[PDB]
Amino acid sequence: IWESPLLLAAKENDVQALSKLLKFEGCEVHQRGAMGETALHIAALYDNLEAAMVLMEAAPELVFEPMTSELYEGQTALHIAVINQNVNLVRALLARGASVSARATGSVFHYRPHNLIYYGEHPLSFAACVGSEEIVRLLIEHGADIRAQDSLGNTVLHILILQPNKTFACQMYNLLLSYDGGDHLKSLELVPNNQGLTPFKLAGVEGNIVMFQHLMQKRKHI
Protein backbone atom coordinates (compact mmCIF):
# COMPACT_ATOMS: atom_id res chain seq x y z
CA ILE A 1 0.00 0.00 0.00
CA TRP A 2 2.43 2.69 1.24
CA GLU A 3 4.72 2.29 -1.82
CA SER A 4 1.80 2.23 -4.33
CA PRO A 5 -0.03 5.54 -4.88
CA LEU A 6 -3.18 3.76 -6.18
CA LEU A 7 -3.49 1.34 -3.24
CA LEU A 8 -2.78 4.22 -0.87
CA ALA A 9 -5.35 6.47 -2.48
CA ALA A 10 -7.93 3.68 -2.17
CA LYS A 11 -7.09 3.26 1.56
CA GLU A 12 -7.36 7.04 2.11
CA ASN A 13 -10.64 7.38 0.16
CA ASP A 14 -8.80 10.03 -1.92
CA VAL A 15 -11.05 10.38 -4.95
CA GLN A 16 -9.01 13.15 -6.62
CA ALA A 17 -5.74 11.19 -6.40
CA LEU A 18 -7.43 8.01 -7.71
CA SER A 19 -8.97 9.83 -10.65
CA LYS A 20 -5.64 11.40 -11.64
CA LEU A 21 -3.80 8.05 -11.38
CA LEU A 22 -6.49 6.18 -13.30
CA LYS A 23 -6.54 8.65 -16.21
CA PHE A 24 -2.86 7.79 -16.96
CA GLU A 25 -2.62 4.13 -17.97
CA GLY A 26 0.51 4.81 -15.87
CA CYS A 27 -0.66 3.04 -12.75
CA GLU A 28 -1.34 -0.60 -13.55
CA VAL A 29 -4.92 -0.68 -12.31
CA HIS A 30 -4.56 -4.42 -11.62
CA GLN A 31 -1.45 -4.05 -9.40
CA ARG A 32 -1.67 -6.04 -6.16
CA GLY A 33 -0.49 -5.82 -2.55
CA ALA A 34 1.25 -8.57 -0.57
CA MET A 35 -2.04 -10.47 0.05
CA GLY A 36 -2.87 -10.39 -3.66
CA GLU A 37 -5.34 -7.58 -3.07
CA THR A 38 -6.38 -4.93 -5.66
CA ALA A 39 -7.16 -1.28 -5.02
CA LEU A 40 -10.84 -2.27 -5.00
CA HIS A 41 -10.28 -4.89 -2.27
CA ILE A 42 -8.54 -2.16 -0.31
CA ALA A 43 -11.44 0.32 -0.79
CA ALA A 44 -13.93 -2.34 0.31
CA LEU A 45 -11.89 -3.34 3.38
CA TYR A 46 -11.65 0.26 4.57
CA ASP A 47 -15.37 0.83 3.86
CA ASN A 48 -14.51 3.54 1.33
CA LEU A 49 -17.56 3.71 -0.88
CA GLU A 50 -16.45 6.69 -2.96
CA ALA A 51 -13.06 5.20 -3.81
CA ALA A 52 -14.73 1.90 -4.66
CA MET A 53 -17.11 3.69 -7.04
CA VAL A 54 -14.30 5.53 -8.79
CA LEU A 55 -12.39 2.27 -9.20
CA MET A 56 -15.43 0.29 -10.44
CA GLU A 57 -16.31 3.01 -12.92
CA ALA A 58 -12.77 3.28 -14.25
CA ALA A 59 -11.90 -0.41 -14.17
CA PRO A 60 -15.05 -2.55 -13.82
CA GLU A 61 -12.99 -5.74 -14.32
CA LEU A 62 -11.75 -5.23 -10.71
CA VAL A 63 -15.22 -6.30 -9.53
CA PHE A 64 -14.46 -9.94 -10.42
CA GLU A 65 -10.90 -10.26 -9.11
CA PRO A 66 -10.20 -12.53 -6.15
CA MET A 67 -7.48 -12.15 -3.55
CA THR A 68 -4.74 -14.58 -4.53
CA SER A 69 -2.79 -15.16 -1.31
CA GLU A 70 -3.20 -18.54 0.38
CA LEU A 71 -4.76 -16.82 3.42
CA TYR A 72 -7.47 -14.97 1.46
CA GLU A 73 -7.72 -17.03 -1.70
CA GLY A 74 -10.94 -16.34 -3.58
CA GLN A 75 -12.14 -13.41 -1.49
CA THR A 76 -13.88 -10.81 -3.69
CA ALA A 77 -14.79 -7.15 -2.99
CA LEU A 78 -18.38 -8.43 -2.55
CA HIS A 79 -17.38 -10.83 0.25
CA ILE A 80 -15.60 -7.88 2.00
CA ALA A 81 -18.54 -5.55 1.57
CA VAL A 82 -20.84 -8.22 3.02
CA ILE A 83 -18.60 -8.68 6.11
CA ASN A 84 -18.62 -4.89 6.66
CA GLN A 85 -22.40 -4.84 6.14
CA ASN A 86 -21.99 -2.01 3.62
CA VAL A 87 -25.36 -2.22 1.94
CA ASN A 88 -24.63 0.57 -0.54
CA LEU A 89 -21.36 -1.09 -1.61
CA VAL A 90 -23.01 -4.52 -1.90
CA ARG A 91 -25.73 -3.03 -4.13
CA ALA A 92 -23.15 -1.20 -6.27
CA LEU A 93 -21.06 -4.34 -6.84
CA LEU A 94 -24.10 -6.48 -7.54
CA ALA A 95 -25.44 -3.90 -10.03
CA ARG A 96 -22.16 -4.22 -11.91
CA GLY A 97 -22.43 -8.00 -12.16
CA ALA A 98 -20.30 -9.12 -9.12
CA SER A 99 -20.54 -12.91 -8.81
CA VAL A 100 -22.76 -14.26 -6.09
CA SER A 101 -21.17 -17.69 -6.69
CA ALA A 102 -17.58 -16.69 -5.88
CA ARG A 103 -16.00 -18.91 -3.26
CA ALA A 104 -13.63 -17.68 -0.55
CA THR A 105 -11.46 -20.74 -0.05
CA GLY A 106 -8.37 -19.22 1.59
CA SER A 107 -7.04 -20.58 4.86
CA VAL A 108 -8.53 -17.83 7.01
CA PHE A 109 -11.98 -18.99 5.89
CA HIS A 110 -11.51 -22.65 6.78
CA TYR A 111 -13.53 -24.46 9.46
CA ARG A 112 -10.64 -24.84 11.95
CA PRO A 113 -10.09 -24.61 15.72
CA HIS A 114 -7.45 -21.87 15.15
CA ASN A 115 -9.73 -19.67 12.96
CA LEU A 116 -12.03 -17.14 14.64
CA ILE A 117 -14.92 -17.40 12.20
CA TYR A 118 -16.39 -19.95 9.94
CA TYR A 119 -18.80 -18.38 7.50
CA GLY A 120 -18.53 -20.84 4.66
CA GLU A 121 -17.33 -19.72 1.24
CA HIS A 122 -20.16 -17.90 -0.55
CA PRO A 123 -21.37 -14.32 -0.20
CA LEU A 124 -24.85 -15.53 0.93
CA SER A 125 -23.27 -17.64 3.70
CA PHE A 126 -21.24 -14.57 4.81
CA ALA A 127 -24.41 -12.42 4.81
CA ALA A 128 -26.40 -14.96 6.88
CA CYS A 129 -23.55 -15.15 9.42
CA VAL A 130 -23.14 -11.43 9.96
CA GLY A 131 -26.99 -11.20 10.34
CA SER A 132 -27.92 -8.77 7.50
CA GLU A 133 -31.46 -9.56 6.25
CA GLU A 134 -31.24 -6.75 3.69
CA ILE A 135 -27.99 -8.06 2.22
CA VAL A 136 -29.34 -11.64 2.23
CA ARG A 137 -32.35 -10.44 0.23
CA LEU A 138 -30.22 -8.41 -2.21
CA LEU A 139 -28.01 -11.46 -2.86
CA ILE A 140 -30.97 -13.80 -3.47
CA GLU A 141 -32.52 -11.20 -5.83
CA HIS A 142 -29.25 -11.37 -7.80
CA GLY A 143 -29.43 -15.14 -8.11
CA ALA A 144 -27.54 -16.45 -5.04
CA ASP A 145 -28.20 -20.18 -4.64
CA ILE A 146 -29.49 -20.94 -1.14
CA ARG A 147 -28.57 -24.60 -1.73
CA ALA A 148 -24.86 -23.89 -2.39
CA GLN A 149 -22.47 -26.15 -0.50
CA ASP A 150 -18.94 -25.43 0.66
CA SER A 151 -15.95 -27.76 0.54
CA LEU A 152 -17.32 -29.62 3.61
CA GLY A 153 -20.75 -30.12 2.03
CA ASN A 154 -22.20 -27.51 4.38
CA THR A 155 -25.14 -25.47 3.20
CA VAL A 156 -25.91 -22.09 4.73
CA LEU A 157 -28.26 -23.96 7.10
CA HIS A 158 -25.35 -26.01 8.53
CA ILE A 159 -23.16 -22.92 8.74
CA LEU A 160 -25.80 -21.11 10.79
CA ILE A 161 -25.82 -24.03 13.28
CA LEU A 162 -22.12 -23.38 13.85
CA GLN A 163 -22.54 -19.67 14.78
CA PRO A 164 -22.42 -18.18 18.36
CA ASN A 165 -25.43 -15.81 18.14
CA LYS A 166 -28.31 -18.32 18.27
CA THR A 167 -31.19 -15.80 18.42
CA PHE A 168 -30.62 -14.08 15.04
CA ALA A 169 -29.34 -17.40 13.59
CA CYS A 170 -32.78 -18.86 14.08
CA GLN A 171 -34.53 -15.93 12.36
CA MET A 172 -32.03 -16.12 9.54
CA TYR A 173 -32.54 -19.88 9.17
CA ASN A 174 -36.26 -19.28 8.69
CA LEU A 175 -35.67 -16.32 6.37
CA LEU A 176 -33.54 -18.53 4.17
CA LEU A 177 -36.14 -21.32 4.17
CA SER A 178 -38.89 -18.87 3.15
CA TYR A 179 -37.12 -18.78 -0.25
CA ASP A 180 -36.96 -22.60 -0.38
CA GLY A 181 -40.77 -22.83 -0.28
CA GLY A 182 -42.80 -25.57 -1.97
CA ASP A 183 -40.16 -26.97 -4.35
CA HIS A 184 -40.94 -30.30 -6.06
CA LEU A 185 -37.97 -32.07 -4.43
CA LYS A 186 -36.03 -32.33 -1.24
CA SER A 187 -36.21 -29.60 1.32
CA LEU A 188 -32.81 -27.97 1.83
CA GLU A 189 -33.21 -29.16 5.44
CA LEU A 190 -32.73 -32.74 4.23
CA VAL A 191 -29.42 -32.08 2.47
CA PRO A 192 -26.51 -33.57 4.45
CA ASN A 193 -22.94 -32.39 4.65
CA ASN A 194 -19.85 -34.54 3.95
CA GLN A 195 -20.07 -35.91 7.50
CA GLY A 196 -23.60 -37.19 6.61
CA LEU A 197 -25.34 -34.78 9.00
CA THR A 198 -28.40 -32.69 8.19
CA PRO A 199 -28.67 -29.34 9.94
CA PHE A 200 -31.02 -30.84 12.61
CA LYS A 201 -28.56 -33.64 13.38
CA LEU A 202 -25.63 -31.23 13.31
CA ALA A 203 -27.38 -29.05 15.86
CA GLY A 204 -27.64 -32.08 18.11
CA VAL A 205 -24.06 -33.13 17.61
CA GLU A 206 -22.74 -29.60 18.31
CA GLY A 207 -24.91 -29.00 21.37
CA ASN A 208 -26.71 -26.05 19.76
CA ILE A 209 -29.68 -26.23 22.14
CA VAL A 210 -31.66 -23.40 20.47
CA MET A 211 -31.43 -24.79 16.97
CA PHE A 212 -31.84 -28.47 18.05
CA GLN A 213 -35.15 -27.68 19.73
CA HIS A 214 -36.32 -25.39 16.90
CA LEU A 215 -35.61 -27.99 14.27
CA MET A 216 -36.94 -30.95 16.29
CA GLN A 217 -40.36 -29.31 16.79
CA LYS A 218 -40.26 -28.26 13.13
CA ARG A 219 -40.16 -31.84 11.83
CA LYS A 220 -42.98 -32.91 14.19
CA HIS A 221 -45.13 -30.09 12.74
CA ILE A 222 -44.02 -31.22 9.25
Curated annotation (Swiss-Prot):
Belongs to the transient receptor (TC 1.A.4) family. TrpV subfamily. TRPV6 sub-subfamily. Residues 1-222 are cytoplasmic. Calcium selective cation channel that mediates Ca(2+) uptake in various tissues, including the intestine. Important for normal Ca(2+) ion homeostasis in the body, including bone and skin. The channel is activated by low internal calcium level, probably including intracellular calcium store depletion, and the current exhibits an inward rectification. Inactivation includes both a rapid Ca(2+)-dependent and a slower Ca(2+)-calmodulin-dependent mechanism; the latter may be regulated by phosphorylation. In vitro, is slowly inhibited by Mg(2+) in a voltage-independent manner. It comes from the Eukaryota. Interacts with TCAF1 and TCAF2. Homotetramer and probably heterotetramer with TRPV5. Interacts with TRPV5. Interacts with S100A10 and probably with the ANAX2-S100A10 heterotetramer. The interaction with S100A10 is required for the trafficking to the plasma membrane. Interacts with calmodulin. Interacts with BSPRY. This is Transient receptor potential cation channel subfamily V member 6. The lineage of its organism: Eukaryota, Metazoa, Chordata, Craniata, Vertebrata. Glycosylated. Residues 50-60 are annotated as: Interaction with calmodulin. Disruption phenotype: Mutant mice have lower body weight than their littermates throughout their lifespan and low fertility, due to impaired calcium homeostasis. Mutant mice display strongly impaired intestinal Ca(2+) uptake and increased urinary Ca(2+) levels. Still, their serum Ca(2+) levels are normal, probably due to compensation by another calcium channel. In spite of this, mutant mice display decreased femoral mineral density; also when they are fed a high-calcium diet. The chain holds residues 84 to 305 of 767 of the full protein. The modification Phosphotyrosine is found at residues 118-119. It comes from Mus musculus.
